[PDB]
């Protein structure tokens with residue numbers, strides 16, 4: 001049962017997470033001085049900029065190939081105090097992203113430093129012998 | 130403890146390697162024929178070209194997802210005869226990049242041929258049964 | 259033993275597949291409104307778009323970082339009836355691409371659906387406990 | 388026995404495609420701003436990397452080549468950009484009153500006229516020499532009043548005296564992800580599969596020489612001379628000839644012309660022709676009869692390979708067209724010559740006394756079908772002499788109801804793209820598709 005791109009946008013966070021493959025596909029795919037040509041040229045560069053931007057963040061988080069990825073960062077109660085039943089079976093990703101918007105910058109900083117900035121050195125020393 | 134972009138430029142190679150995520154973030158991110166538009170558009174294209182250039186080498190070296198990557202290539206003494214104490218706890222990546230600049234091309238050639246050009250064929254034959 | 263770019267174009271598929279790093283390297287690397295500047299800018303975006311096109315397909319196949327990637331798709335006899343000795347020791351990648359060119363779109367469609375569209379759900383359910 | 392597909396990234400697989408190629412010229416330091424190299428063309432690499440591909444047989448088609456259609460649009464685009472900041476001669480459409488330079492029983496006329504000046508209210512009357520080919524009468528009844536050839540049809544722009552028209556080698560390169568395949572077959576005709584195939588990133592040094600009938604300063608053919616044509620049995624398609632031994636031709640303009648700079652506005656400087664100091668001698672070109680007849684004889688030996696072992700082959704002067712397609716037109720030192728090739732094609736073939744070719748010189752030219760734009764070539768001060776290297780011909784049959792008894796050949800130049808086909812016949816642009824699937828006995832580890 002597929003609804004389409006952003007089809008589960010109003011769904012709960014648990015029902016929308018089951019269709020992450022849908023939004024991942026439709027996220028990248030005499031004179032040429034026409035105004036439309038300039039618009040097409042600047043739109044293609046704009047498109048690959050946002051695509052590589054998301055893949056860059058997934059690269060420094062050690063989640064390059066996966067769509068659901070677990071980490072080492074413990075969830076701070078100051079970000080949200082809701083229960084697991086109150087998030088995945090009561091809230092949508094839209095109103096959830098609006099609630100964590102004030103802490104997404106801090107989470108990303110800890111998301112790359114606490115683990116994959118530390119894991120690569122620990123994995124280097126674990127594979128030392 | 131984060132200092133900022135290029136914060137560990139003057140630090141030791143061992144202390145600088147613990148802040149690889151800092152340089153990784155700040156590395157990619159009627160008529161528009163204005164001189165500044167032409168510059169700005171040409172700067173974004175030049176930026177994403179250099180980013181994919183490095184990621185291109187990380188693909189052929191088998192180090193696509195990691196920031197620290199161990200290999201199979203043995204270090205030749207002709208490139209540098211210094212010990213781990215003199216390199217990681219006394220030298221900076223700047224004066225280290227200056228000392229290996231005469232051999233970085235040779236190292237890159239073995240870095241793509243000795244391992245991932247041989248490992249993937251052995252991975253095919255080992256997973257053949 | 260390196261011959262150069264496209265050096266193994268006329269060799270067998272077994273001898274040409276050992277030089278995948280050769281073609282992979284040379285695949286990506288007052289007014290500036292001159293005919294040569296506009297062409298140059300449009301060529302650099304064209305270059306990085308063809309590159310990200312192949313990387314995108316390798317992303318939905320789970321083969322992003324590897325040069326030789328094995329899958330779960332069974333090879334149908336309707337595509338080609340030749341044996342491994344008759345393919346890897348008699349045919350080149352040029353004439354082999356011509357024979358399967360009528361089925362490459364069907365293989366690509368099954369290559370994304372048979373494994374990484376099914377594995378990710380099973381990878382989530384196997385690591386669920 | 389259990390087969391599974393496998394992804395191979397980097398396979399040597401290419402496909403016929405057309406992309407945007409760019410310029411390349413060597414580090415020639417120097418009088419500069421030539422039209423073709425422009426301000427900046429890509430500097431050629433100190434060492435080109437030509438890589439031969441063994442056991443590779445590729446199809447080539449010099450007539451459906453996209454490199455010619457792009458290059459023709461590149462040369463035309465370079466021409467307009469080098470004339471836009473130059474002085475436009477739109478006010479030079481005044482009624483001219485001319486006379487003949489004191490000889491009894493002339494190709495140039497002395498004309499006086501009113502011309503504008505640096506100031507609006509002030510006018511000047513100047514005298515200047517013009518060629519008869521650049522001037523048409525206005526009364527045809529007839530009086531002695533004339534006008535420019537273009538002023539009735541198209542605008543005219545004076546070429547800047549700083550830019551040069553000398554062709555320098557231009558290398559066409561392929562962008563990343565694309566490659567150019569060169570066919571190194573000595574006996575390679577127009578189309579067909581090429582046995583010996585190599586690959587390069589840029590083409591060789593191709594000099595964009597704008598010519599008619601005769602191909603000057605072109606690349607010679609190795610071994611025997613080559614006759615390439617899209618359809619040899621078709622008269623409507625031109626016949627591209629490539630020599631193996633180059634023929635020499637010396638062209639001179641004995642007239643010692645003088646440059647007469649007259650100001651026609653604020654910053655506008657129009658350079659006319661002053662009185663010729665010395666004798667009046669019309670231009671010409673000398674061709675060695677012994678070498679020309681020998682080379683022409685070497686041509687008919689290869690023409691018989693497509694029209695019977697024994698047949699009648701004749702050569703006559705161009706009977707169709709006017710102006711530039713009936714004469715050997717080319718540039719030499721800045722002035723544009725138009726040489727009558729009647730003395731070259733005056734033989735019939737069956738079973739040190741150099742040839743002279745009279746030439747005429749224009750100054751208002753209409754090249755590349757350009758309906759709308761005309762260029763005024765400024766007078767080159769001094770005596771002009773250039774030595775060229777005719778390496779090819781562009782011939783055309785006459786057809787008719789002949790029963791294959793006799794066969795005539797006449798020179799022509801119906802288009803300019805035939806000049807680039809003589810230097811792009813061996814190159815071919817293809818895109819690289821590095822994605823390839825193949826079955827092996829390998830399965831992904833579940834782990």
Ligand SMILES: *[C@@H]1O[C@H](CO)[C@@H](O[C@@H]2O[C@H](CO)[C@@H](O[C@@H]3O[C@H](CO)[C@@H](O)[C@H](O)[C@@H]3O)[C@H](O)[C@H]2NC(C)=O)[C@H](O)[C@H]1NC(C)=O
Pocket residue numbers: 553554596603604717718719720772773774775776
């Ligand atoms: C085919 O190639 C030959 C190469 O020799 C061309 O002849 C050469 O044309 C150049 C044009 O710049 C001549 O250079 C000029 O020399 C005069 C001499 O005083 C100088 O005043 C100019 O400033 C310029 O440097 C060169 O001399 C001439 N070659 C010889 C031996 O004289 C020929 O023009 C080419 N064919 C065509 C159609 O252009």
Ligand SMILES: *[C@@H]1O[C@H](CO)[C@@H](O[C@@H]2O[C@H](CO)[C@@H](O)[C@H](O)[C@H]2NC(C)=O)[C@H](O)[C@H]1NC(C)=O
Pocket residue numbers: 604605606607633776778
């Ligand atoms: C133009 O004619 C000249 C006549 O000499 C030819 O020039 C020589 O070619 C050989 C072959 O490489 C060189 O070794 C000489 O240095 C050349 N001399 C000069 C003065 O260039 C030349 O081959 C002819 N070129 C064409 C395109 O026909």
Ligand SMILES: *[C@@H]1O[C@H](CO)[C@@H](O[C@@H]2O[C@H](CO)[C@@H](O)[C@H](O)[C@H]2NC(C)=O)[C@H](O)[C@H]1NC(C)=O
Pocket residue numbers: 704705706707713729
């Ligand atoms: C080609 O050759 C013909 C044959 O001579 C030329 O025709 C003559 O041209 C002269 C002028 O040069 C006239 O006086 C004659 O009346 C023409 N006809 C003859 C002699 O039968 C012709 O001009 C030459 N050139 C072209 C471009 O056709």
Ligand SMILES: *[C@@H]1O[C@H](CO)[C@@H](O)[C@H](O)[C@H]1NC(C)=O
Pocket residue numbers: 007008009010011012
């Ligand atoms: C919309 O609401 C209905 C009823 O609760 C539910 O079954 C459905 O899954 C919801 N879909 C979305 C996209 O919210």
Ligand SMILES: *[C@@H]1O[C@H](CO)[C@@H](O)[C@H](O)[C@H]1NC(C)=O
Pocket residue numbers: 076077078
């Ligand atoms: C919890 O959150 C506060 C405020 O966001 C932060 O200052 C603190 O360091 C966090 N503590 C832990 C253990 O993550």
Ligand SMILES: *[C@@H]1O[C@H](CO)[C@@H](O)[C@H](O)[C@H]1NC(C)=O
Pocket residue numbers: 081082083
């Ligand atoms: C979690 O649920 C319990 C009820 O089982 C509730 O009392 C508690 O307040 C909830 N936690 C919150 C809202 O942080």
Ligand SMILES: *[C@@H]1O[C@H](CO)[C@@H](O)[C@H](O)[C@H]1NC(C)=O
Pocket residue numbers: 136137139140141
């Ligand atoms: C710079 O040198 C000082 C010397 O005392 C050292 O303590 C410090 O770690 C170095 N690196 C810095 C300040 O980034």
Ligand SMILES: *[C@@H]1O[C@H](CO)[C@@H](O)[C@H](O)[C@H]1NC(C)=O
Pocket residue numbers: 204205206207
């Ligand atoms: C290091 O390189 C030198 C110079 O090519 C060579 O002679 C030597 O055998 C190499 N040693 C090792 C251990 O690779």
Ligand SMILES: *[C@@H]1O[C@H](CO)[C@@H](O)[C@H](O)[C@H]1NC(C)=O
Pocket residue numbers: 211212214215
């Ligand atoms: C390492 O190299 C330094 C400098 O060359 C030298 O002083 C030292 O003795 C070497 N060995 C050790 C164990 O530090």
Ligand SMILES: *[C@@H]1O[C@H](CO)[C@@H](O)[C@H](O)[C@H]1NC(C)=O
Pocket residue numbers: 227228229230231
């Ligand atoms: C690299 O080569 C240059 C040129 O000879 C030389 O001056 C420099 O010392 C070399 N550096 C190293 C680290 O070998």
Ligand SMILES: *[C@@H]1O[C@H](CO)[C@@H](O)[C@H](O)[C@H]1NC(C)=O
Pocket residue numbers: 332333334335336
């Ligand atoms: C090949 O394709 C045909 C047609 O869909 C199908 O009937 C057959 O089972 C397939 N065989 C294999 C081995 O996949």
Ligand SMILES: *[C@@H]1O[C@H](CO)[C@@H](O)[C@H](O)[C@H]1NC(C)=O
Pocket residue numbers: 360
């Ligand atoms: C496969 O494609 C080629 C493309 O030229 C075509 O000639 C051939 O008939 C096709 N074969 C089948 C079985 O469809």
Ligand SMILES: *[C@@H]1O[C@H](CO)[C@@H](O)[C@H](O)[C@H]1NC(C)=O
Pocket residue numbers: 487493494
């Ligand atoms: C001037 O000379 C031309 C060419 O020789 C000639 O045709 C013309 O008749 C002459 N002028 C007059 C007025 O006859």
Ligand SMILES: *[C@@H]1O[C@H](CO)[C@@H](O)[C@H](O)[C@H]1NC(C)=O
Pocket residue numbers: 501510511512
């Ligand atoms: C043009 O020249 C004639 C003499 O040839 C003169 O009578 C007339 O006044 C001039 N016109 C202008 C506008 O100077």
Ligand SMILES: *[C@@H]1O[C@H](CO)[C@@H](O)[C@H](O)[C@H]1NC(C)=O
Pocket residue numbers: 576577578579580616619
């Ligand atoms: C060129 O050679 C090919 C070789 O297969 C042949 O088919 C073709 O007819 C030839 N063309 C001419 C004009 O001789």
Ligand SMILES: *[C@@H]1O[C@H](CO)[C@@H](O)[C@H](O)[C@H]1NC(C)=O
Pocket residue numbers: 488497498499514515662663
């Ligand atoms: C050209 O004509 C002008 C004006 O009639 C006259 O003064 C001059 O002497 C003539 N000179 C030549 C070379 O024809």
